[PDB]
Paper text:
The structure of AC2aCel5A was solved to 1.8 Å, and contained two molecules in the asymmetric unit. The final model comprised residues 9–397; no electron density was observed for the nine N-terminal residues nor for the final eight C-terminal residues, including the His6-tag. The native structure was solved to 1.8 Å resolution and revealed a narrow substrate-cleft, likely determining the specificity of the enzyme for linear and less substituted substrates. A surface projection shows the narrow groove stretching across the enzyme, with the active-site located in its center. A comparison of the active-site clefts of the GH5s shows that AC2aCel5A has a narrower active site cleft than its homologues, especially in the vicinity of the −3 to −1 sub-sites. This is primarily caused by the loop region between β3 and α3’ (red surface), which protrudes into the substrate-binding cleft and which is extended in AC2aCel5A, compared to the examined homologues (residues 115–126). Nonetheless, AC2aCel5A is unique in that it has an exceptionally narrow active site cleft, due to an extended loop region that seems well adapted to (only) acting on less-substituted β-glucans. AC2aCel5A contains a tryptophan “clamp” in its putative +1 and +2 subsites, analogous to what has been observed in other glycoside hydrolases acting on insoluble polysaccharides. Furthermore, in both the apo- and the complex structure, extra electron density was also observed close to, and between Trp178 and Trp254 in the substrate-binding cleft of both chain A and B.
AC2aCel5A is an endo-acting cellulase that is encoded within the first reported cellulolytic PUL, originating from an uncultured Bacteroidetes phylotype. As previously reported, AC2aCel5A is an endoglucanase active on β-(1,4) glycosidic bonds between glucose units in soluble and insoluble cellulosic substrates and in linear β-glucans. The enzyme displays the typical (β/α)8 barrel structure associated with the GH5 family. The six closest structural homologues, which include all the biochemically characterized members of subfamily GH5_4, were identified using the Dali server and were used to produce a structure-based multiple sequence alignment using the PROMALS3D server. This allowed identification of the conserved catalytic residues, i.e. Glu172 and Glu303, acting as the catalytic acid and nucleophile/base, respectively.
Author numbering: 9 to 397
Protein backbone atom coordinates (compact mmCIF):
# COMPACT_ATOMS: atom_id res chain seq x y z
CA UNK A 1 0.00 0.00 0.00
CA UNK A 2 1.37 3.45 -0.91
CA UNK A 3 0.05 4.84 2.40
CA UNK A 4 2.51 2.47 4.16
CA UNK A 5 5.52 3.94 2.43
CA UNK A 6 8.58 5.61 4.07
CA UNK A 7 7.34 9.15 3.27
CA UNK A 8 3.95 8.80 4.99
CA UNK A 9 5.69 7.15 7.93
CA UNK A 10 7.88 10.27 8.14
CA UNK A 11 4.80 12.58 8.07
CA UNK A 12 3.21 10.58 10.89
CA UNK A 13 6.38 10.84 12.96
CA UNK A 14 5.66 14.55 13.38
CA UNK A 15 2.63 13.50 15.42
CA UNK A 16 1.09 16.47 17.19
CA UNK A 17 3.55 19.38 17.16
CA UNK A 18 3.58 23.03 18.22
CA UNK A 19 4.23 26.37 16.50
CA UNK A 20 6.60 28.94 17.99
CA UNK A 21 4.15 31.58 16.69
CA UNK A 22 4.22 35.40 16.75
CA UNK A 23 7.95 34.97 17.36
CA UNK A 24 10.61 34.83 14.57
CA UNK A 25 7.65 35.63 12.28
CA UNK A 26 6.71 38.85 14.16
CA UNK A 27 7.41 42.09 12.33
CA UNK A 28 6.57 45.74 11.97
CA UNK A 29 7.77 48.62 9.79
CA UNK A 30 9.37 46.09 7.43
CA UNK A 31 11.59 44.15 9.80
CA UNK A 32 11.11 41.01 11.84
CA UNK A 33 12.20 40.83 15.48
CA UNK A 34 11.75 37.82 17.75
CA UNK A 35 10.19 39.89 20.59
CA UNK A 36 8.33 42.27 18.27
CA UNK A 37 4.84 41.00 19.13
CA UNK A 38 5.38 40.63 22.84
CA UNK A 39 6.74 37.11 23.29
CA UNK A 40 10.01 36.70 25.10
CA UNK A 41 12.83 34.97 23.26
CA UNK A 42 12.85 31.16 23.18
CA UNK A 43 15.31 29.20 25.26
CA UNK A 44 16.36 25.56 25.54
CA UNK A 45 13.77 25.22 28.30
CA UNK A 46 11.08 26.15 25.75
CA UNK A 47 11.90 23.16 23.57
CA UNK A 48 12.42 20.86 26.57
CA UNK A 49 8.89 21.80 27.68
CA UNK A 50 7.49 20.82 24.31
CA UNK A 51 9.17 17.38 24.29
CA UNK A 52 8.14 16.72 27.89
CA UNK A 53 4.52 17.47 27.01
CA UNK A 54 4.62 14.93 24.16
CA UNK A 55 4.94 17.10 21.09
CA UNK A 56 6.99 15.32 18.41
CA UNK A 57 7.60 18.30 16.21
CA UNK A 58 7.96 22.05 16.26
CA UNK A 59 7.42 24.62 13.56
CA UNK A 60 9.52 27.78 13.77
CA UNK A 61 7.96 30.23 11.29
CA UNK A 62 10.50 32.87 10.26
CA UNK A 63 9.84 36.22 8.59
CA UNK A 64 12.98 37.26 6.66
CA UNK A 65 11.87 40.75 5.66
CA UNK A 66 14.28 43.38 7.10
CA UNK A 67 17.22 40.90 7.11
CA UNK A 68 17.61 40.55 3.40
CA UNK A 69 20.19 42.60 1.48
CA UNK A 70 19.71 44.31 -1.87
CA UNK A 71 19.40 42.51 -5.16
CA UNK A 72 21.02 40.68 -6.79
CA UNK A 73 22.51 38.60 -3.96
CA UNK A 74 19.72 39.18 -1.37
CA UNK A 75 22.29 38.45 1.34
CA UNK A 76 20.74 37.28 4.62
CA UNK A 77 22.02 39.12 7.68
CA UNK A 78 24.24 36.63 9.54
CA UNK A 79 22.95 37.42 13.02
CA UNK A 80 19.38 36.60 11.94
CA UNK A 81 20.36 33.34 10.26
CA UNK A 82 22.45 32.52 13.40
CA UNK A 83 19.38 32.78 15.63
CA UNK A 84 17.33 30.57 13.30
CA UNK A 85 20.31 28.14 13.40
CA UNK A 86 20.41 28.27 17.20
CA UNK A 87 16.67 27.68 17.66
CA UNK A 88 16.70 24.77 15.21
CA UNK A 89 19.51 23.14 17.20
CA UNK A 90 17.84 23.70 20.59
CA UNK A 91 14.79 21.92 19.16
CA UNK A 92 17.04 19.08 17.87
CA UNK A 93 18.65 18.83 21.29
CA UNK A 94 15.17 18.28 22.67
CA UNK A 95 14.48 15.44 20.16
CA UNK A 96 11.92 17.33 18.01
CA UNK A 97 11.42 17.23 14.28
CA UNK A 98 11.75 20.85 13.11
CA UNK A 99 10.11 22.83 10.32
CA UNK A 100 11.34 26.29 9.22
CA UNK A 101 9.89 28.41 6.44
CA UNK A 102 9.41 31.76 4.77
CA UNK A 103 6.47 33.24 6.67
CA UNK A 104 5.13 36.84 6.72
CA UNK A 105 7.32 37.85 3.76
CA UNK A 106 4.33 36.56 1.83
CA UNK A 107 1.53 37.91 4.00
CA UNK A 108 -1.02 38.96 1.32
CA UNK A 109 -3.80 40.77 3.23
CA UNK A 110 -4.14 44.53 3.70
CA UNK A 111 -3.94 44.52 7.46
CA UNK A 112 -0.18 44.43 8.06
CA UNK A 113 2.08 46.57 10.30
CA UNK A 114 4.63 46.44 7.42
CA UNK A 115 2.63 48.01 4.58
CA UNK A 116 4.71 48.11 1.41
CA UNK A 117 7.46 45.75 2.61
CA UNK A 118 6.03 42.36 1.52
CA UNK A 119 8.33 41.55 -1.40
CA UNK A 120 6.72 38.13 -1.87
CA UNK A 121 3.71 39.60 -3.68
CA UNK A 122 1.38 37.26 -5.55
CA UNK A 123 -0.93 39.76 -7.35
CA UNK A 124 2.14 41.77 -8.39
CA UNK A 125 3.63 38.58 -9.87
CA UNK A 126 0.45 37.67 -11.76
CA UNK A 127 0.19 41.22 -13.19
CA UNK A 128 3.83 41.19 -14.37
CA UNK A 129 6.05 38.34 -15.52
CA UNK A 130 9.10 40.55 -14.97
CA UNK A 131 7.98 41.01 -11.34
CA UNK A 132 7.43 37.24 -11.06
CA UNK A 133 10.97 36.64 -12.35
CA UNK A 134 12.39 39.00 -9.66
CA UNK A 135 10.43 37.36 -6.85
CA UNK A 136 11.67 33.98 -8.07
CA UNK A 137 15.31 35.13 -8.05
CA UNK A 138 14.92 36.36 -4.42
CA UNK A 139 13.29 33.03 -3.45
CA UNK A 140 16.15 31.15 -5.04
CA UNK A 141 18.85 33.23 -3.29
CA UNK A 142 17.10 32.93 0.05
CA UNK A 143 16.53 29.20 -0.05
CA UNK A 144 20.07 28.62 -1.35
CA UNK A 145 21.48 30.43 1.72
CA UNK A 146 19.19 28.67 4.12
CA UNK A 147 20.05 25.29 2.65
CA UNK A 148 23.80 26.04 2.70
CA UNK A 149 23.67 26.88 6.42
CA UNK A 150 21.86 23.61 7.21
CA UNK A 151 23.63 21.33 4.72
CA UNK A 152 24.97 19.11 7.53
CA UNK A 153 21.59 18.72 9.24
CA UNK A 154 19.62 15.61 8.35
CA UNK A 155 16.00 14.66 7.86
CA UNK A 156 14.82 15.73 11.33
CA UNK A 157 14.98 19.26 9.75
CA UNK A 158 12.13 20.00 7.27
CA UNK A 159 11.98 23.04 5.00
CA UNK A 160 8.52 24.48 4.26
CA UNK A 161 8.78 26.59 1.11
CA UNK A 162 6.23 29.32 1.79
CA UNK A 163 3.39 30.08 4.18
CA UNK A 164 -0.06 31.42 3.20
CA UNK A 165 0.07 32.80 -0.33
CA UNK A 166 -2.96 34.74 -1.50
CA UNK A 167 -4.29 38.01 -2.87
CA UNK A 168 -5.96 39.27 0.38
CA UNK A 169 -9.39 37.68 0.00
CA UNK A 170 -8.44 34.42 1.72
CA UNK A 171 -9.40 32.17 -1.19
CA UNK A 172 -12.76 33.84 -1.95
CA UNK A 173 -11.46 36.36 -4.43
CA UNK A 174 -10.15 36.58 -7.93
CA UNK A 175 -8.34 33.25 -7.50
CA UNK A 176 -11.68 31.62 -8.34
CA UNK A 177 -12.17 33.58 -11.59
CA UNK A 178 -8.77 34.46 -13.09
CA UNK A 179 -8.46 31.28 -15.13
CA UNK A 180 -6.12 29.75 -12.53
CA UNK A 181 -3.45 32.41 -12.97
CA UNK A 182 -2.80 32.81 -9.21
CA UNK A 183 -2.69 29.03 -8.71
CA UNK A 184 -0.23 28.72 -11.57
CA UNK A 185 2.23 31.31 -10.21
CA UNK A 186 2.04 29.73 -6.73
CA UNK A 187 2.90 26.39 -8.36
CA UNK A 188 5.85 28.01 -10.11
CA UNK A 189 7.06 29.53 -6.81
CA UNK A 190 7.01 26.13 -5.11
CA UNK A 191 9.00 24.64 -8.02
CA UNK A 192 11.61 27.40 -7.74
CA UNK A 193 11.92 26.86 -3.95
CA UNK A 194 12.34 23.09 -4.34
CA UNK A 195 14.95 23.64 -7.11
CA UNK A 196 16.93 26.03 -4.82
CA UNK A 197 16.82 23.69 -1.83
CA UNK A 198 18.02 20.74 -3.90
CA UNK A 199 20.83 22.92 -5.37
CA UNK A 200 22.05 23.88 -1.86
CA UNK A 201 23.95 20.59 -1.49
CA UNK A 202 24.66 18.00 1.17
CA UNK A 203 21.71 16.75 3.15
CA UNK A 204 19.36 19.15 1.35
CA UNK A 205 19.44 16.41 -1.34
CA UNK A 206 17.06 14.11 0.47
CA UNK A 207 15.45 16.51 2.98
CA UNK A 208 11.65 16.47 3.25
CA UNK A 209 10.18 19.63 1.81
CA UNK A 210 6.67 20.87 2.68
CA UNK A 211 4.80 22.70 -0.07
CA UNK A 212 1.48 24.56 0.36
CA UNK A 213 -1.52 25.35 -1.80
CA UNK A 214 -3.46 28.61 -2.06
CA UNK A 215 -3.66 30.37 1.35
CA UNK A 216 -3.05 26.88 2.93
CA UNK A 217 -6.69 26.07 2.26
CA UNK A 218 -7.07 22.28 2.08
CA UNK A 219 -9.68 22.23 -0.68
CA UNK A 220 -7.92 24.79 -2.90
CA UNK A 221 -4.80 22.69 -2.31
CA UNK A 222 -6.39 19.37 -3.29
CA UNK A 223 -7.96 21.10 -6.33
CA UNK A 224 -5.00 23.12 -7.66
CA UNK A 225 -1.66 22.26 -6.06
CA UNK A 226 0.90 20.75 -8.38
CA UNK A 227 3.65 18.86 -6.57
CA UNK A 228 6.96 20.18 -7.90
CA UNK A 229 9.18 18.02 -10.10
CA UNK A 230 11.90 16.81 -7.73
CA UNK A 231 15.42 15.34 -8.15
CA UNK A 232 14.58 12.50 -5.78
CA UNK A 233 11.40 10.56 -5.13
CA UNK A 234 9.08 10.67 -2.14
CA UNK A 235 10.60 13.68 -0.38
CA UNK A 236 7.69 16.19 -0.72
CA UNK A 237 4.92 16.77 1.86
CA UNK A 238 1.72 18.78 1.45
CA UNK A 239 1.31 21.51 4.04
CA UNK A 240 -2.16 22.76 4.94
CA UNK A 241 -3.72 24.95 7.64
CA UNK A 242 -7.07 24.63 9.40
CA UNK A 243 -8.92 26.88 11.81
CA UNK A 244 -12.26 25.40 10.65
CA UNK A 245 -14.92 26.42 11.10
CA UNK A 246 -13.55 29.91 11.48
CA UNK A 247 -16.44 31.47 13.40
CA UNK A 248 -16.00 28.78 16.08
CA UNK A 249 -12.23 28.21 16.19
CA UNK A 250 -10.83 31.58 15.17
CA UNK A 251 -13.23 34.50 15.67
CA UNK A 252 -15.17 32.74 18.46
CA UNK A 253 -18.46 34.28 17.44
CA UNK A 254 -19.80 30.88 18.40
CA UNK A 255 -18.52 29.07 21.48
CA UNK A 256 -19.80 25.53 21.05
CA UNK A 257 -19.05 22.93 18.35
CA UNK A 258 -20.45 19.63 17.18
CA UNK A 259 -23.58 17.62 17.59
CA UNK A 260 -24.12 18.41 21.30
CA UNK A 261 -23.49 22.14 20.89
CA UNK A 262 -26.29 24.67 20.72
CA UNK A 263 -24.24 27.88 20.17
CA UNK A 264 -22.75 26.49 16.97
CA UNK A 265 -21.79 27.52 13.45
CA UNK A 266 -24.98 26.46 11.65
CA UNK A 267 -24.62 23.11 9.96
CA UNK A 268 -20.84 22.92 10.31
CA UNK A 269 -19.53 20.29 12.69
CA UNK A 270 -17.93 16.87 12.77
CA UNK A 271 -19.00 15.63 9.34
CA UNK A 272 -17.70 18.76 7.63
CA UNK A 273 -14.28 18.54 9.28
CA UNK A 274 -13.93 14.84 8.50
CA UNK A 275 -14.97 15.49 4.91
CA UNK A 276 -12.10 17.93 4.54
CA UNK A 277 -9.70 15.41 5.98
CA UNK A 278 -11.06 12.73 3.65
CA UNK A 279 -10.22 14.85 0.63
CA UNK A 280 -6.61 15.14 1.82
CA UNK A 281 -6.45 11.47 2.62
CA UNK A 282 -7.68 10.44 -0.81
CA UNK A 283 -5.65 12.95 -2.81
CA UNK A 284 -2.34 12.52 -1.01
CA UNK A 285 -2.02 9.94 1.79
CA UNK A 286 -3.69 7.12 -0.21
CA UNK A 287 -1.11 7.79 -2.95
CA UNK A 288 1.89 7.72 -0.58
CA UNK A 289 2.18 11.52 -0.30
CA UNK A 290 2.34 12.82 3.29
CA UNK A 291 0.17 15.65 4.53
CA UNK A 292 0.66 17.75 7.64
CA UNK A 293 -1.22 20.60 9.20
CA UNK A 294 1.44 23.31 9.52
CA UNK A 295 -1.13 25.09 11.68
CA UNK A 296 -4.33 24.14 13.39
CA UNK A 297 -6.19 25.24 16.43
CA UNK A 298 -9.07 26.84 18.23
CA UNK A 299 -8.96 29.69 20.70
CA UNK A 300 -9.35 29.40 24.45
CA UNK A 301 -12.67 30.13 26.15
CA UNK A 302 -13.49 32.02 29.38
CA UNK A 303 -16.27 29.66 30.57
CA UNK A 304 -15.35 26.15 31.72
CA UNK A 305 -18.35 24.65 29.98
CA UNK A 306 -17.26 26.37 26.72
CA UNK A 307 -13.68 25.20 27.25
CA UNK A 308 -14.95 21.60 27.32
CA UNK A 309 -16.15 22.06 23.75
CA UNK A 310 -12.68 23.26 22.67
CA UNK A 311 -11.14 20.12 24.24
CA UNK A 312 -13.78 17.98 22.48
CA UNK A 313 -12.87 19.67 19.21
CA UNK A 314 -9.20 18.81 19.72
CA UNK A 315 -9.88 15.20 20.69
CA UNK A 316 -12.18 14.61 17.75
CA UNK A 317 -10.20 16.30 14.95
CA UNK A 318 -6.81 15.01 16.12
CA UNK A 319 -8.20 11.44 16.24
CA UNK A 320 -9.56 11.91 12.74
CA UNK A 321 -6.09 13.05 11.61
CA UNK A 322 -4.24 10.10 13.18
CA UNK A 323 -6.69 7.69 11.52
CA UNK A 324 -5.82 9.29 8.18
CA UNK A 325 -2.03 9.27 8.88
CA UNK A 326 -1.95 13.07 9.05
CA UNK A 327 0.24 14.99 11.49
CA UNK A 328 -0.56 18.48 12.81
CA UNK A 329 1.10 21.39 14.55
CA UNK A 330 -0.89 23.49 17.00
CA UNK A 331 -0.71 27.29 16.53
CA UNK A 332 0.61 28.90 19.72
CA UNK A 333 1.07 32.67 19.64
CA UNK A 334 1.76 33.03 23.37
CA UNK A 335 -1.45 35.08 23.96
CA UNK A 336 -3.14 34.02 27.20
CA UNK A 337 -6.52 35.68 26.51
CA UNK A 338 -9.89 34.03 25.92
CA UNK A 339 -11.59 34.53 22.56
CA UNK A 340 -10.08 36.00 19.42
CA UNK A 341 -6.28 35.37 19.19
CA UNK A 342 -6.26 33.43 22.41
CA UNK A 343 -3.97 30.57 21.32
CA UNK A 344 -1.19 30.60 23.96
CA UNK A 345 -0.86 27.32 25.87
CA UNK A 346 2.92 27.15 26.54
CA UNK A 347 5.19 30.04 27.51
CA UNK A 348 7.59 30.78 24.65
CA UNK A 349 10.57 31.52 26.94
CA UNK A 350 10.07 29.06 29.83
CA UNK A 351 8.28 26.07 28.24
CA UNK A 352 5.77 26.04 31.09
CA UNK A 353 2.01 25.80 30.67
CA UNK A 354 0.04 29.04 30.42
CA UNK A 355 -3.10 28.99 32.54
CA UNK A 356 -5.11 25.84 31.81
CA UNK A 357 -3.11 25.08 28.67
CA UNK A 358 -2.08 21.63 29.88
CA UNK A 359 -5.64 20.40 29.41
CA UNK A 360 -5.68 21.59 25.77
CA UNK A 361 -2.26 20.14 25.02
CA UNK A 362 -3.25 16.79 26.58
CA UNK A 363 -6.53 16.68 24.59
CA UNK A 364 -4.73 17.04 21.27
CA UNK A 365 -1.62 14.91 21.86
CA UNK A 366 -3.29 12.07 23.79
CA UNK A 367 -6.10 11.70 21.23
CA UNK A 368 -3.70 11.54 18.26
CA UNK A 369 -1.30 9.21 20.12
CA UNK A 370 -3.89 6.76 21.49
CA UNK A 371 -3.21 3.22 20.22
CA UNK A 372 -6.24 1.45 21.61
CA UNK A 373 -8.44 0.09 18.79
CA UNK A 374 -11.48 0.68 21.01
CA UNK A 375 -10.71 4.42 21.12
CA UNK A 376 -12.50 5.57 18.03
CA UNK A 377 -14.06 8.60 16.47
CA UNK A 378 -17.43 7.19 17.59
CA UNK A 379 -16.32 6.90 21.25
CA UNK A 380 -15.18 10.54 21.26
CA UNK A 381 -18.42 11.58 19.51
CA UNK A 382 -20.55 9.77 22.11
CA UNK A 383 -18.65 11.45 24.95
CA UNK A 384 -19.17 15.03 23.65
CA UNK A 385 -19.91 17.57 26.40
CA UNK A 386 -23.22 19.15 27.40
CA UNK A 387 -24.25 22.57 26.08
CA UNK A 388 -24.48 25.42 28.59
CA UNK A 389 -27.23 27.12 26.50
Amino acid sequence: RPMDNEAVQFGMSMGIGWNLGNQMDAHYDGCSYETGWGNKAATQQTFNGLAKAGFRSVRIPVTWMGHIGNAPTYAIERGWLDRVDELVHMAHKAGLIVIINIHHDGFGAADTPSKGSHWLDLPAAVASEERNQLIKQELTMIWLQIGKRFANDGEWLVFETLNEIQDGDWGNGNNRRDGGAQYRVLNEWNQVCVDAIRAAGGKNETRYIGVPGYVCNPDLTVENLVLPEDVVPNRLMVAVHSYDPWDYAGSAKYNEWGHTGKDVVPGVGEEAYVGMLNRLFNMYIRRGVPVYFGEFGAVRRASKADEEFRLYYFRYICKAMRDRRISALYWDNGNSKAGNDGFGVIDHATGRFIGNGEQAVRAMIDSWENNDPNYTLQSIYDSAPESSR
